[PDB]
Amino acid sequence: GRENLYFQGMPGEEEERAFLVAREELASALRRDSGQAFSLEQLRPLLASSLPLAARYLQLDAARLVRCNAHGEPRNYLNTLSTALNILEKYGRNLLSPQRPRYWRGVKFNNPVFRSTVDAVQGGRDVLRLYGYTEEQPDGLSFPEGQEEPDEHQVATVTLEVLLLRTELSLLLQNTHPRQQALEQLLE
Amino acid sequence: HHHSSGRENLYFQGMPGEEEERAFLVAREELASALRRDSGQAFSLEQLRPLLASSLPLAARYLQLDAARLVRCNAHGEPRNYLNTLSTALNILEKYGRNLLSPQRPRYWRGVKFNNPVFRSTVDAVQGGRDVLRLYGYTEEQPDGLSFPEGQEEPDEHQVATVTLEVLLLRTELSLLLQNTHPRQQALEQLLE
Amino acid sequence: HHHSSGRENLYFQGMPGEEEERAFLVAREELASALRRDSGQAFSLEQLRPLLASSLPLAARYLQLDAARLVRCNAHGEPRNYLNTLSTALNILEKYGRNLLSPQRPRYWRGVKFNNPVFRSTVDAVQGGRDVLRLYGYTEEQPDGLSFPEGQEEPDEHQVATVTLEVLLLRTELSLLLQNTHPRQQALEQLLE
Amino acid sequence: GRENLYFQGMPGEEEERAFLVAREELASALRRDSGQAFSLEQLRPLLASSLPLAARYLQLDAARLVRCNAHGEPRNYLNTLSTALNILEKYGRNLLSPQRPRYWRGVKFNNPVFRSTVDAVQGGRDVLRLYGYTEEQPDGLSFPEGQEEPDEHQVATVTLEVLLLRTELSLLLQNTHPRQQALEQLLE
Amino acid sequence: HHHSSGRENLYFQGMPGEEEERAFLVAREELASALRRDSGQAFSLEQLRPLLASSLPLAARYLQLDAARLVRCNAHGEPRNYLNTLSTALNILEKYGRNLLSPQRPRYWRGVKFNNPVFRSTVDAVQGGRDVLRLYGYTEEQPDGLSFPEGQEEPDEHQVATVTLEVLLLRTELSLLLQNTHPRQQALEQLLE
Amino acid sequence: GRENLYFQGMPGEEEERAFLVAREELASALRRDSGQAFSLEQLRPLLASSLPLAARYLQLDAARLVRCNAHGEPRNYLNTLSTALNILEKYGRNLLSPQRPRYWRGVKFNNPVFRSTVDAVQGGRDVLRLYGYTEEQPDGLSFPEGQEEPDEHQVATVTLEVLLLRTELSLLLQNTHPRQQALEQLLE
Amino acid sequence: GRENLYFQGMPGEEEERAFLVAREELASALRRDSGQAFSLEQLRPLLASSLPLAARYLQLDAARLVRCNAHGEPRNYLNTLSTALNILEKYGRNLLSPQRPRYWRGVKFNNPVFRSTVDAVQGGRDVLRLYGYTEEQPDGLSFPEGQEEPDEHQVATVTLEVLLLRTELSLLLQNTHPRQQALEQLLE
Amino acid sequence: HHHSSGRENLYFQGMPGEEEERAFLVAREELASALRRDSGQAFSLEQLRPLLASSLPLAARYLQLDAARLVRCNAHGEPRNYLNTLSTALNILEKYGRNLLSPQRPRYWRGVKFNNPVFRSTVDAVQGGRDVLRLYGYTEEQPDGLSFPEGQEEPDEHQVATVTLEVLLLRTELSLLLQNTHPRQQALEQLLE
């Protein structure tokens, strides 16, 4: 689309450029409209990529999220982990809203949605840290006092990766994922 | 493929053993936020009734507005009458609140004059009317009227939205009483003490 | 200077001794009407929770949809799993409903084919899935699939809105169960009988 | 406005033409947007008129509504009667909506809003009759079976007169009505 | 990656040796179509000037409206005056046209009464005023006024848009004359014969 | 409307308060939407006022505009003067636009619309001065270099008075003005 | 998207179903908004398909359009043929507009855009025939008198195929087409 | 009851003996302003043709863009071809301009890289392509590409709108040439010198 007019050519790395450009395109679309839904076809460059997990998820520790939460059958762990990711995706999008939630600056561990979704997976809390919720309280997790606003680029990057990971996990539950062994790439 | 988990609901602390209260407070913020998005936002009965029908104490429902005093001290004659007198005041007080949230505030938003004819006949017709203006930010009292502090450039959006919501809720309550359709059989008595 | 008295609330009969039920039914119509105004209308948790949190019997909450059967007969393994399996089906069933309310219906709206890959893996994955399609109007069964009667030019808007609302409510319920935030501690058990 | 370009001249009846034209203008504005609010200045030709009550309210039996419900002080009767009129105005506007209420065809006497507002005044039920709710049941009042739609001109006329009467009653409670003895014109 | 080739421009026949005329006629249809899309559409000077600045004969520019007669027969006194008198009439005649294109026509759109005070003082103040109404469809003459044929359910959209456009163009012309900014030095004379 | 909730009461000056409040209301409506049209009924408090010309036009020297340009019959002078006012009203409204004309800072005497409309009346140039075009060049008239923006309240006040004066002059041409001798009030 | 919920499964023909479903999806999107632009990623199922030309273009005689107009180098013929297709695409879209061009019923051979674009390629006229312009005049080509409206499904099918063919021809000029020898598939 | 007198037309100096030029310049500003209001604004043939059909010299029509050089220096082979090659470049150059007017600029708007694949194949395919980027503000040349000055926080809206308009006009011209519908019989030759 647009970002493609500005990203540097990458001779001999055409598949990686295509990835990097798409990522940036969708990051910008989230910043323009945080409530926006993306189609499978819009995500395709990011889903079909042969690139390794370490290079597709730059912020999000996807390896530790799946490996540390593969309890029982894939059908079990997968449902739990995508319920957490769904909630996490909302935390990210909400931070890019033109009118953020009044109490956007803090998440509380005792919060009823949080306690049973995000906090049901190891690595969940870390993801909020990636959004900017970097300060520890006994009560929960918060943005630094002096930070007046979210880093919208950081938020969009993480939000995109969260939604991407969830999408991947959904196509596996469907038995519909492009990469033939995408679970084995994530689990080992 | 999304979970049903609200929006403000994600940030408000848990309140174990107080789930109806928490649900009320979260619904309350969403309506306050909606007024901040659009100062002219109208709310339907179905959006307000779940807030009004909760069994909570009055002190739990009305955090800024002193609803007890507004009802009790103006309970002159029959409810058929003073509820209308009060509704009229509350109605005008809501406009004062919404106007402060408007993208283009009234030129003269900084002050309210006691000899203003609408104010005189509606809001100043009831005890507590001035206090509500105070809650919006009209805290500096001249003999001429009430005004915002000279130094303060803007109203406090959150505070104003809050007070405006509560003004609106209570007027809804009085209005349901007038229609004998308030969901709580004892709603008036609770307001009188 | 208006009274707070709803809209559909003005036409529904009184129900003395059944005020919570009546309030639920009125809130239910408004959401159904909203889907008819806009087939893509999203509803917030605060709009749906007051419908879900009522103590009413299941037969009082679900007038068209057979929610008991949908939950009970597909309760295979652990709720963590079959609630997701059911949610996935309900989600797709909601799209079928909304699509029938769309100002431009899918070209092929008149029929659903059993070998359709989305249908096969989602809706046909659960008992009761076909019955729901039947409720939308897909009442004529070929061996190929289900379809609307040849003679019938349009879907029944009210019926479709109704069923789509209920499909949506139940999926909200399952979703609140998955999040351990359903307002009723016994909500699952009620659905299982 | 617009209707003024079409209404016939009325030599020697300039004040009555002005009334008739305004009425029609506002009737049309209700038909275009049934949820629309009118300002005191928009209603002025209809409020300031010296014309007699019989000629300002053509459908609405305003005389019988005020005279039959003047219980106690004006402050009392006036509040009750304007609460009824407020509800009646909603019944009218709702019938001119682009998506009418599902059960628009019938009003039920046991309806909780109806029972304590409209049915609190003698003449209340008649007003619904003027909207088209002409068929009697023990249960309530209904549009004839064969009538597929409201008469939008009849509905707008009555809706306007209802709102006009209520507005008048409001300016008296305010002690703000243009005609010096508008209550005496209505009560005798 | 699209070619710049207009829209109505794709359907109008070629006119070799008459390219400026054809371009005028195509621009004319687009503005007529725009009035049909939105009866309140305002047009800027830049949209109208290219139509007015063409060297075409008057009979080539005004296909329905008899602009010659409107200017010539009402040329009483000085242009400073009668151009205003004419503009006032044309202005009202444009409202009559636009109103017939409105999604909700004036209740009384079917007839115009000669004793109507606006009509009397504006449109009936000039020769040709009635003829223009005739062009819109008010073809049946009573002694009371002019009206559409009883049988005819709707105005002719295309005809009305056409006439309304021309009424508008000419009033633009008179207005440019009043401002000494008409692009043609001889524009008045052309209208007088 | 809204401004009425804030303007001070004026015991014994009810007709002047009504004027002052309406003026302010319409000034604000111009600032919200500079392209907005006003109805005769919206202008009525400002047209029907018995208040003297000196108190109805506070910025605009209406006396000098009409008296100095009454050439020939009223029909003549009136048409010329309302053509000037129409153009002047555009200069005012344009300054309250959310995207002002690129060259809003300067008006040029040789400008073709200006030369034959505004500059056809004595007092025309002064009106632009009232909008903020206070600096003299041989070429035209300009806003001071250091002034980054129009005084939107000054602009709205003058714009309103311009439109009001033009409206008055239009109702006289119509023989339709509320005050029986409004021309004599303006001309002497 | 939506149409995918209704199209019949096609065991052993997954690549053809994917094509057929996408086609129908985009046909519907054209019918909803005839002025709408499609992205390369939206067209991908239709561009990347290994399916034969005869099965990708069902109405549009793509074979005869390219083979009969390969004059000179590909760079030449390709530019000419995509200029024709661009114009043809407008004729199709215009027929699906909510307010069709006034003279939509007829195309004239002497029309200046037509004469030098569409009529510059053999097969051009046939494409209009596919839109419904089936009746021959010496003057041009027209819809049958009795046909009150376009067949919006026929129009959308042809419009889509036109835009698809043009898109293909554009990616060849770019040297960017997915199929390695897409010109050889079209030319022989 | 308004006069037809434009908007930008009220501020531009008079130009006696140069009325067609002045009218062109005023129409030009309005389209530039329209791009500033909405960076995605599409313009119809009828809005652009009156600018293109004027007899003015090329130096009078193209104030920023060096249209002569763009056409002349890339006139390789036949117009059927190089006009397409040029149109493709101009098309991409217009996106670069509009993107700088967007309410949310591309994250990487500050720089254009010469090895960028779209740039390489389209804009860098023609002499003058880089100069146009320079006109938008990409004035600092690295070996990597072109970029805005580090210090400059925003593009120059007016300049960018101007250049983008001209890029658009010329591409319209080339497009009319390709369709043999340019209003001036000699339009190509004028561009070649």
Q: Using a CB-CB distance cutoff of 8 angstroms, which residues of chain D are in contact with residue F174?
A: none
Q: Are D158 and D60 in contact (CB under 8 A)?
A: yes
Residue range of the domain that includes E98? 1-193
C-alpha span between H49 and E6 (Å, rounded): 10
Q: Using a CB-CB distance cutoff of 8 angstroms, which residues of chain A are in contact with residue H108?
A: 3, 6-7, 24
Q: Are A13 and A55 in contact (CB under 8 A)?
A: no
Is the minimum CB–CB distance between D103 and chain C shorter than 8 Å?
A: yes
Q: Residue A5 and residue H116: Cβ atoms within 8 Å? A: yes
Q: Residue D87 and residue C5: Cβ atoms within 8 Å? A: yes
CB-CB: which of H96, H109, H116 is closest to A8?
H116
DSSP conformational letter for H2:
-
C-alpha span between C71 and A52 (Å, rounded): 40
**Which residue of chain D has the CA closest to B84?**
D79
E30: exposed, middle or buried (Cβ count in 10 Å: 0-12, 13-18, 19+) = buried
HEC profile for chain F?
Answer: CCHHHCCCCCCCCHHHHHHHHHHHHHHHHHHHCCCCCCCHHHHHHHHHCCCCHHHHCCCCCHHHHHHCCCCCCHHHHHHHHHHHHHHHHHHHHHCCCCCCCCCCCEEECCCHHHHHCHHHCCCHHHHHHHHCCCEECCCEEECCCCCCCCCHHHHHHHHHHHHHHHHHHHHHHCCCCCCCCHHHHHHC
**Which residue of chain F has the CA closest to B112?**
F6
Q: Residue F103 and residue H14: Cβ atoms within 8 Å? A: no
Amino acid found at G132: G
**Which residue of chain H has the CA closest to G112?**
H181
Query: How many other C-beta atoms lie within 10 A of the C-beta of residue B72?
Result: 14
Q: Residue G5 and residue C111: Cβ atoms within 8 Å? A: no
Q: Residue E118 and residue D4: Cβ atoms within 8 Å? A: yes
Amino acid found at G129: R
Amino acid found at H44: S
DSSP conformational letter for C38:
-
The token pair at B153 is 């450039």
Amino acid found at C107: R
Is the minimum CB–CB distance between E179 and chain F shorter than 8 Å?
A: yes
HEC profile for A142-157?
Answer: ECCCCCCCCCHHHHHH
A79, A82, A111: best mutation site toward chain C, by most C Cβ within 10 Å?
A: A79
DSSP conformational letter for B112:
E
Q: Residue A6 and residue H109: Cβ atoms within 8 Å? A: yes
D3, D4, D5: best mutation site toward chain E, by most E Cβ within 10 Å?
A: D5
The token pair at D83 is 């609460």
The token pair at F161 is 């008075």
Q: Residue D113 and residue B81: Cβ atoms within 8 Å? A: no
Q: Are A168 and A63 in contact (CB under 8 A)?
A: no
List, edge to edge, every strand of the sheet that includes B145-147: B111-113, B145-147, B140-141
Is the minimum CB–CB distance between G134 and chain H shorter than 8 Å?
A: no
H51: exposed, middle or buried (Cβ count in 10 Å: 0-12, 13-18, 19+) = buried
**Which residue of chain A has the CA closest to G42?**
A41
The three-state secondary structure class of D138 is coil
In angstroms, this model's resolution equals 2.4
Q: Residue C183 and residue B23: Cβ atoms within 8 Å? A: yes
DSSP conformational letter for B55:
-
The token pair at D71 is 């219980």
Is the minimum CB–CB distance between E112 and chain D shorter than 8 Å?
A: yes
CATH, residue B142:
1.20.58.2190
Q: Residue A101 and residue B2: Cβ atoms within 8 Å? A: no
| Residue with tokens 């939509």, as numbered in its chain | G104
Q: Are G142 and G103 in contact (CB under 8 A)?
A: no
CB-CB: which of D75, D116, D174 is closest to B179?
D116
CB pairs under 8 A between E and F: 23
Q: Residue E109 and residue D31: Cβ atoms within 8 Å? A: no
Is the minimum CB–CB distance between D83 and chain B shorter than 8 Å?
A: yes
Distances (CA, A) of F43 to B56, E108, F89, H12, H180: 50, 26, 15, 33, 55
**Which residue of chain B has the CA closest to C17?**
B183
C-alpha span between A81 and A79 (Å, rounded): 6
Q: Using a CB-CB distance cutoff of 8 angstroms, which residues of chain F are in contact with residue D42?
A: 41
D14: exposed, middle or buried (Cβ count in 10 Å: 0-12, 13-18, 19+) = exposed
**Which residue of chain B has the CA closest to C51?**
B50
Angle at E30 between CA E25 and CA E35, to 5 degrees: 125
Is the minimum CB–CB distance between A153 and chain H shorter than 8 Å?
A: yes
Q: Are D128 and D141 in contact (CB under 8 A)?
A: yes
Q: Using a CB-CB distance cutoff of 8 angstroms, which residues of chain B are in contact with residue F9?
A: 113, 115-117, 120
Q: Are B63 and B162 in contact (CB under 8 A)?
A: yes
**Which residue of chain A has the CA closest to H93?**
A5
Q: Using a CB-CB distance cutoff of 8 angstroms, which residues of chain G are in contact with residue C115?
A: 8-9, 11
Sorted by sequence, the CB contacts under 8 Å of residue C128 that are 6+ apart come out as C66, C69, C70, C73, C74
C-alpha span between C86 and C99 (Å, rounded): 20
Neighbours of E, requiring at least 3 CB pairs below 8 Å, are D, F, G, H
Q: Are E86 and E70 in contact (CB under 8 A)?
A: yes
CB-CB: which of C4, C44, C183 is closest to B6?
C44
Q: Residue F44 and residue D39: Cβ atoms within 8 Å? A: no
The token pair at A23 is 């990522």
CA distance F11 to chain H (A): 38
Q: Are G2 and C116 in contact (CB under 8 A)?
A: no
Q: Are C98 and C167 in contact (CB under 8 A)?
A: no
Residues just before a chain gap in chain C (C–N exceeding 2.5 Å) are: none
Q: Using a CB-CB distance cutoff of 8 angstroms, which residues of chain D are in contact with residue B123?
A: none
> First CA to last CA across chain E, in angstroms?
48
Q: Residue D79 and residue B78: Cβ atoms within 8 Å? A: no
- B136: nearest Cα among B98, B92, B102: B98
Cα-based torsion angle of the residue sequence G108, G109, G110, G114 in order, rounded to the nearest 10 degrees? 90
Say whether the F–C interface has 3 or more Cβ pairs within 8 Å.
no
Query: In chain H, which residue ranges form alpha helices assigned H by DSSP?
Result: 19-37, 45-52, 58-61, 67-72, 79-101, 117-121, 129-136, 157-178, 187-192
Q: Are A80 and A166 in contact (CB under 8 A)?
A: no
Q: Residue H33 and residue F91: Cβ atoms within 8 Å? A: no
Q: Residue B81 and residue D76: Cβ atoms within 8 Å? A: yes
| Structural domains in chain E (count) | 1
Residue A125: in which H helix or E strand, if any? helix A124-131
Q: Using a CB-CB distance cutoff of 8 angstroms, which residues of chain A are in contact with residue C179?
A: 83, 112-113, 116-117
The three-state secondary structure class of C185 is coil
Q: A107 phi and psi, to 5 degrees?
A: -115, 140
C-alpha span between H132 and H92 (Å, rounded): 11
- E171: nearest Cα among E84, E43, E56: E84
List, edge to edge, every strand of the sheet that includes C145-147: C111-113, C145-147, C140-141
Q: Are B69 and B128 in contact (CB under 8 A)?
A: yes
Distances (CA, A) of A43 to A63, A91, A153, E144, G21: 20, 20, 18, 70, 19
CA distance A75 to chain C (A): 7
Is the minimum CB–CB distance between F12 and chain B shorter than 8 Å?
A: no
**Which residue of chain A has the CA closest to G38?**
A1
C2, C9, C10, C156: best mutation site toward chain D, by most D Cβ within 10 Å?
A: C10
> First CA to last CA across chain H, in angstroms?
48
C-alpha span between H114 and A9 (Å, rounded): 8
